């Protein structure tokens, strides 16, 4: 079978996808997110492992076949979260920073300033955007537990979620990572995919606790046991949610583009083997195509998206449930200038805002009780529009009927109020969570389970496009709001 | 460190142990008691299982350290609960008909009035009641289409709740059923300690694929390949939880009684070496003491006596948010003529006869429409009396010393109510859900560790014996009302 497991940020979803693109489980658990002072959000490794176990072994709902035929494992874990654990005492005495809280601003700003600030960006593409894993580490391993000297002798070996789940999965393993997530961690690099020492040696310790990385289909078993081969069933995938979605959605050819609006609005393309970067405030990333090999591509720079939606329900309830967007909200015309950019800690986009926390905007009396709700629906799609519109202006590659998916993306209406200004169609792949399948496939590419990428092509469904509407000759009229009331 | 866990009830939490003997509280994990309809509680096993999955390994997070310095892990689970698989294939024939169920009654027609039941009173020591695991199995057996052919071939397999918990852990190479579930399982004659092949012939039931009488007090796990594990991991057996509670307290000496609640009302105690078949309703089940051997005991528990939060919340939505129970449903008076007899799906209790439909009856006039809180609460005492009193009157020797260690009553009302209503102060403890606690102390004895007991109970600081008070002598009023309002 295929154990297409997902993780989002904590939202443990996905199950044992029964080979032929089918389902047999209802794994959906969103653990209680915490919001400390200001925006110092960070869920302890405890919450990570406790939830992961529920999906891993828990995925056995209907198709509970023993290790004798499961396989096809492809962990679609989260990404950028740098967790730690104490090897000597054997018990983790700390928390885990999250990729959605710019709690790094306190310190990172005093070190950049001079030339080296742009140094990384003007050449690579990425930029030290505070919450970028490595940068966050410069604070973590200091205030929490006084033992600087101990940090020299390993002590609390650091590593991303990948290096975490694997390490303490069953017990015994090596600090592994993967290319896809690697670049994001900033310790590695897109134009390197290897362990860049030199600069990194500035994180209090000279790269002492260096995580390992994996290249292609890391189809591998474990170190659990106790003199017996147990909880040592095969595996792969081991990649970030958004990264798995990238190649998973049949993206194995030129010009293949997608979209996945959920906790984050990440769009990735397929530029063959060209590590390029869009000088217009855009980042860099990797991709896949043709045969089982790593390609290169660009992405969209977003901090968060579906956070605004998860926010009100756990505060300004009102409507109780978030899916209301599909129901009592449709005939409500549209947002109407209230562009509430999901700014919990910083904004994101080409503008970043390393100090701006919170962004109400849309100062209009319309903001009554049930008003705030639809604001996010509109905003998220438009947030995608921000990078989309600017992208064509440089690359020149026009975007066709792109593929879209995601838990939050389930709102049919979201597709309509998005493609509008772009004047084109979109097609949602016949699969609510196609993301899980991507990383999952990377297990069969070893034991001769899967021949090669060229096979799935014959089975697809693209008859899910929305009919273009006549009313639109003005579109950018709203667009102007992006160039107003925000700075 | 050491690990002991519960399963079923309402919350399959996990309670991890530490150095010497310390419990790091309970984690907070819960999953609804999934049920189809009516008394046909075909409760999905995988549902309650998913919660248990993290409980197996993820729960370790409390103590911090993982499976690399552990001991015997004792398991307590809801008894009965038949579950049938496809030999080694995870895909069940249907699902699990849990301990709380009644649907075999109308089927047992061609059995009860056939004379071949009188011996059951001396052999297994039972009476005519649908509340018997074996009957539920025989029910499902004589229910599924063409299941007869599927039987002989070797496709379907006989089993109960005891297997699954271990099954998924073993790797699927285990089919156990601890002797503890005998008696309740009609086809598990206590006088024989083994399955009764006799009746099987009546329905042409194979005497082949039957579970194995396993252990509870020590490691085990399960084998697939020779030696191996297969995700096996050292397990430390299983046992019916609201039976095991008998051992959770020193109900060994002739002068100590206990009381389990769990989800409703479960009273049981060790009787002695020889089958004391005292015609008084209470049936005979397996029980032991210092010497972990097969001995005799009396029991005749009830499905539930008044599941407050459950029905009040998910049923009437009166208390809304669970905390609100003790918060409001225990302050200014209560009950008043109200006599609600628990018997939604099944009856149980000395009534036995399912025909006695229990529900809300003795309602007073002038009661505001929104009047439902002190129902189940007050009702508990009335039913608990019908089971605890019978036990005392059976033996003759009335014992004032009733201590509770079955949790459930988180609302202090029971202590500050149930006590004076019967004058005997039902004494509490610190750790409410002692049922799970007593699980790890079992496995330890075999491994020496604590050697026996003596000091181990140095944490049973009950504070003070709640002194019985004068304002209680008036309760017989409603008692002589209850002994009439029910038919």
Tab-separated table of N, CA and C in Angstrom, chain A residues 29 46 49-50 53-54 57 60-67 90-91 168 171 224 226-231, chain B residues 29 31 46 50 53-54 57-58 61 64-66 88 90-91 167-168 171-172 224 227-231 233:
chain	number	residue	atom	x	y	z
A	29	UNK	N	-6.816	15.648	13.009
A	29	UNK	CA	-6.678	16.143	14.374
A	29	UNK	C	-5.820	17.401	14.429
A	46	UNK	N	6.756	17.963	22.490
A	46	UNK	CA	5.798	17.049	23.095
A	46	UNK	C	4.559	16.967	22.215
A	49	UNK	N	5.428	15.058	18.690
A	49	UNK	CA	5.482	13.599	18.786
A	49	UNK	C	4.135	12.953	19.146
A	50	UNK	N	3.445	13.506	20.142
A	50	UNK	CA	2.155	12.961	20.567
A	50	UNK	C	1.123	12.936	19.443
A	53	UNK	N	2.328	10.246	16.446
A	53	UNK	CA	2.021	8.851	16.746
A	53	UNK	C	0.562	8.515	16.422
A	54	UNK	N	-0.335	9.474	16.645
A	54	UNK	CA	-1.764	9.294	16.375
A	54	UNK	C	-2.046	9.052	14.894
A	57	UNK	N	0.774	5.241	13.453
A	57	UNK	CA	0.191	3.950	13.779
A	57	UNK	C	-1.336	3.997	13.722
A	60	UNK	N	-4.372	3.170	10.565
A	60	UNK	CA	-5.052	1.900	10.330
A	60	UNK	C	-6.534	1.975	10.700
A	61	UNK	N	-7.333	2.533	9.801
A	61	UNK	CA	-8.766	2.646	10.035
A	61	UNK	C	-9.473	1.439	9.431
A	62	UNK	N	-9.555	1.400	8.106
A	62	UNK	CA	-10.211	0.304	7.410
A	62	UNK	C	-9.183	-0.713	6.914
A	63	UNK	N	-8.232	-0.243	6.112
A	63	UNK	CA	-7.185	-1.097	5.549
A	63	UNK	C	-6.027	-1.326	6.521
A	64	UNK	N	-6.269	-2.112	7.565
A	64	UNK	CA	-5.259	-2.358	8.564
A	64	UNK	C	-4.382	-3.560	8.277
A	65	UNK	N	-3.700	-3.558	7.132
A	65	UNK	CA	-2.816	-4.667	6.775
A	65	UNK	C	-1.502	-4.538	7.534
A	66	UNK	N	-1.054	-5.649	8.107
A	66	UNK	CA	0.182	-5.699	8.884
A	66	UNK	C	1.409	-5.291	8.050
A	67	UNK	N	2.600	-5.221	8.701
A	67	UNK	CA	3.819	-4.822	7.944
A	67	UNK	C	4.072	-5.604	6.653
A	90	UNK	N	18.871	11.869	27.791
A	90	UNK	CA	17.917	11.097	27.019
A	90	UNK	C	16.509	11.661	27.022
A	91	UNK	N	16.306	12.781	27.715
A	91	UNK	CA	14.991	13.412	27.786
A	91	UNK	C	15.017	14.889	27.382
A	168	UNK	N	13.530	10.195	17.181
A	168	UNK	CA	12.719	9.615	18.238
A	168	UNK	C	11.445	8.955	17.728
A	171	UNK	N	12.836	3.461	19.169
A	171	UNK	CA	14.069	4.198	19.403
A	171	UNK	C	15.442	3.630	19.114
A	224	UNK	N	14.917	1.039	15.865
A	224	UNK	CA	14.147	0.781	17.092
A	224	UNK	C	14.772	-0.318	17.940
A	226	UNK	N	15.270	-4.089	20.151
A	226	UNK	CA	15.701	-4.502	21.459
A	226	UNK	C	16.212	-5.912	21.330
A	227	UNK	N	16.883	-6.128	20.204
A	227	UNK	CA	17.449	-7.423	19.838
A	227	UNK	C	16.459	-8.131	18.904
A	228	UNK	N	15.363	-7.451	18.580
A	228	UNK	CA	14.355	-7.992	17.690
A	228	UNK	C	14.022	-6.954	16.616
A	229	UNK	N	13.671	-7.399	15.411
A	229	UNK	CA	13.319	-6.484	14.307
A	229	UNK	C	11.878	-6.006	14.484
A	230	UNK	N	11.698	-4.923	15.239
A	230	UNK	CA	10.346	-4.413	15.544
A	230	UNK	C	10.190	-2.895	15.419
A	231	UNK	N	9.053	-2.514	14.846
A	231	UNK	CA	8.781	-1.117	14.606
A	231	UNK	C	9.974	-0.585	13.821
B	29	UNK	N	-5.692	13.652	25.533
B	29	UNK	CA	-6.156	12.823	24.435
B	29	UNK	C	-7.514	12.164	24.772
B	31	UNK	N	-11.349	10.650	22.508
B	31	UNK	CA	-12.063	10.355	21.270
B	31	UNK	C	-13.472	9.827	21.581
B	46	UNK	N	-11.300	0.695	15.869
B	46	UNK	CA	-10.235	1.572	15.390
B	46	UNK	C	-10.353	2.982	15.970
B	50	UNK	N	-7.177	4.410	17.862
B	50	UNK	CA	-6.368	5.554	17.439
B	50	UNK	C	-5.832	6.325	18.649
B	53	UNK	N	-3.086	4.393	20.228
B	53	UNK	CA	-1.829	4.366	19.486
B	53	UNK	C	-0.772	5.292	20.083
B	54	UNK	N	-1.097	6.571	20.238
B	54	UNK	CA	-0.148	7.510	20.825
B	54	UNK	C	0.177	7.088	22.253
B	57	UNK	N	3.406	4.848	22.606
B	57	UNK	CA	4.759	5.421	22.554
B	57	UNK	C	4.801	6.937	22.729
B	58	UNK	N	3.913	7.643	22.037
B	58	UNK	CA	3.879	9.108	22.107
B	58	UNK	C	3.699	9.606	23.553
B	61	UNK	N	6.376	11.156	26.331
B	61	UNK	CA	6.742	12.572	26.449
B	61	UNK	C	6.637	13.159	27.858
B	64	UNK	N	9.523	12.199	29.538
B	64	UNK	CA	10.607	12.687	28.707
B	64	UNK	C	11.332	11.571	27.980
B	65	UNK	N	11.927	10.652	28.737
B	65	UNK	CA	12.665	9.542	28.142
B	65	UNK	C	11.742	8.606	27.370
B	66	UNK	N	12.353	7.898	26.415
B	66	UNK	CA	11.636	6.935	25.570
B	66	UNK	C	11.931	5.437	25.934
B	88	UNK	N	-5.464	-13.096	9.466
B	88	UNK	CA	-4.292	-12.245	9.673
B	88	UNK	C	-4.540	-10.884	9.013
B	90	UNK	N	-6.206	-7.436	8.525
B	90	UNK	CA	-6.773	-6.436	9.411
B	90	UNK	C	-8.272	-6.191	9.206
B	91	UNK	N	-8.695	-6.182	7.902
B	91	UNK	CA	-10.117	-5.988	7.471
B	91	UNK	C	-11.124	-6.946	8.166
B	167	UNK	N	-2.733	-7.075	19.364
B	167	UNK	CA	-2.663	-7.384	17.938
B	167	UNK	C	-1.860	-6.380	17.116
B	168	UNK	N	-2.323	-5.138	17.074
B	168	UNK	CA	-1.635	-4.107	16.306
B	168	UNK	C	-0.202	-3.878	16.775
B	171	UNK	N	2.301	-7.176	15.755
B	171	UNK	CA	2.458	-6.971	14.330
B	171	UNK	C	1.334	-7.719	13.634
B	172	UNK	N	0.388	-8.206	14.431
B	172	UNK	CA	-0.726	-8.949	13.903
B	172	UNK	C	-0.576	-10.452	14.196
B	224	UNK	N	5.777	-12.701	14.676
B	224	UNK	CA	5.365	-12.866	13.296
B	224	UNK	C	6.339	-13.885	12.700
B	227	UNK	N	11.355	-15.428	15.975
B	227	UNK	CA	11.959	-14.412	16.794
B	227	UNK	C	11.306	-13.135	16.311
B	228	UNK	N	12.080	-12.201	15.768
B	228	UNK	CA	11.501	-10.978	15.222
B	228	UNK	C	10.657	-10.214	16.246
B	229	UNK	N	9.807	-9.341	15.701
B	229	UNK	CA	8.868	-8.470	16.373
B	229	UNK	C	7.748	-8.230	15.387
B	230	UNK	N	8.085	-7.389	14.402
B	230	UNK	CA	7.142	-6.993	13.398
B	230	UNK	C	6.371	-5.805	13.931
B	231	UNK	N	7.132	-4.912	14.613
B	231	UNK	CA	6.599	-3.722	15.261
B	231	UNK	C	6.103	-4.128	16.656
B	233	UNK	N	7.360	-5.038	19.736
B	233	UNK	CA	7.699	-4.253	20.944
B	233	UNK	C	7.227	-4.998	22.185
